[PDB]
Amino acid sequence: TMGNSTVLSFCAFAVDAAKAYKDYLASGGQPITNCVKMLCTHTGTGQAITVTPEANMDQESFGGASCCLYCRCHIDHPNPKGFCDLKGKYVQIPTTCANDPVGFTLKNTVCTVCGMWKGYGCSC
Ligand SMILES: Nc1ccc2ccccc2n1
Numbered sequence: 163t164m165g166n167s168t169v170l171s172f173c174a175f176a177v178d179a180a181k182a183y184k185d186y187l188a189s190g191g192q193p194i195t196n197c198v199k200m201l202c203t204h205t206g207t208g209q210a211i212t213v214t215p216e217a218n219m220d221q222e223s224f225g226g227a228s229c230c231l232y233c234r235c236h237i238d239h240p241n242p243k244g245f246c247d248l249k250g251k252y253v254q255i256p257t258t259c260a261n262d263p264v265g266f267t268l269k270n271t272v273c274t275v276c277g278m279w280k281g282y283g284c285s286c
C-alpha cells in the first residue's frame with residue numbers, strides 16, 4: 163500500500179538493496195507489483211529463465227527485467243560484469259510465489275543440471 167516507487171527508492175539507495183527488499187517483505191510489506199505477466203498456455207518446459215515463456219501448470223511467466231530488483235531500481239547488478247540473468251528473457255515463477263516475482267528471483271537459484279529453480283521445479 164506504500165507504492166512501488168516508495169519501496170524501490172528505499173531499496174535503490176540502500177547499501178544492500180537485496181537485504182532492504184528481503185527485510186521489507188519479512189516486516190509484512192506488500193510486494194512490488196506491475197511485473198509484466200505473459201499470456202501463455204502453461205504447457206512449457208518449466209525451466210526457470212527462457213528465450214520465450216515456458217510456464218508449466220505450476221508456474222506463471224513474466225518479462226524478466228520487470229521481475230529483477232536491480233533492473234526495477236535502475237542500479238548496477240551485483241557481479242563484476244554487472245550482467246543481468248533476467249533482462250531480455252522470460253522468468254517462470256511458481257504460482258505459490260507469483261504474488262512476488264521480484265522477491266522470488268532475488269531469493270532463489272537456478273539448478274545448473276535441469277535449469278529449474280532449486281527447491282521448487284528442480285527434481286535433481
Ligand atoms: N498456472 C496456471 C494454470 C492455469 C491458469 C489459468 C488461467 C490463469 C492462470 C493460470 N495459471
Ligand SMILES: [Cl-]
Pocket residue numbers: 166167196
Ligand atoms: Cl509503477
Ligand SMILES: [Cl-]
Pocket residue numbers: 208221254255256278279282283284
Ligand atoms: Cl519452479
Ligand SMILES: [Zn+2]
Pocket residue numbers: 227230231232233234239246247248249
Ligand atoms: Zn536485472
Ligand SMILES: [Zn+2]
Pocket residue numbers: 273274275276277278284285286
Ligand atoms: Zn535440478
